[PDB]
Design a protein around this ligand. Sequence first.
Ligand SMILES: O=C1c2ccccc2-c2n[nH]c3cccc1c23
Length: 259
Amino acid sequence: ECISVKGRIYSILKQIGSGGSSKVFQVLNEKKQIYAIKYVNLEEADNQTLDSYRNEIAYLNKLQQHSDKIIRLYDYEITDQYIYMVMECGNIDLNSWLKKKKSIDPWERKSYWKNMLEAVHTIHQHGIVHSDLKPANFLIVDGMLKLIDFGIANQMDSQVGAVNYMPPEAIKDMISPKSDVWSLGCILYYMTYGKTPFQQIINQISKLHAIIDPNHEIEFPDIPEKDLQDVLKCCLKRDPKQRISIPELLAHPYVQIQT
Ligand SMILES: O=C1c2ccccc2-c2n[nH]c3cccc1c23
């Protein structure tokens, strides 16, 4: 105990996430149903930050209706000092799950992949490119991946990280939906081969040079699922024009042909 969002009282079971100042609490309503409550402190947010927070809240609220692979947002209270967001509660985030799991069941992987496509497809269909997709951005809810954020709000402890998932065209350019495809392709590559394509290059500068270098051959060890191979090869094509799109991925035999 205790939080109060728009009249209704919620008792704090424990803190799932910390920050930030951004704290996600596992909580229970008056009828002991389980929710998550994200608490944000606005007392040091400037006007762009605030607007970005407002913008993402608006979209998450709208895109509720369009897919159930987008995390449910049930209600929220929002003042000048804080934000409270009553949300669907989840088992574990994908990054923590992957880290702990020894190796994924081939059926489980393909199923998660469909979830990831459905959610990312939805945000694209409203002009939203995430542009920073990591396993951390996905939540396992009832054995099912859901996208937690759209990457709008978050422009506000290591030494971390996630340069592994960075597409080459973001580096050469120093928009667009193909950037998200690359990043999803790295999440799958990880679920397939246990590491990200360039994970073993532990030097940062070297890593990026490797990502943008066309002569650097990305490895794709032979595996039973030749479908999976092909999907991985298509998402990790350095020329975004050549890269496969989400609609093409949704018509791919990997997610259609059974199984
Ligand atoms: O970050 C998490 C999170 C992290 C670990 C475990 C559960 C959750 C979780 N469950 N519901 C929500 C809503 C928003 C964010 C998050 C959740």
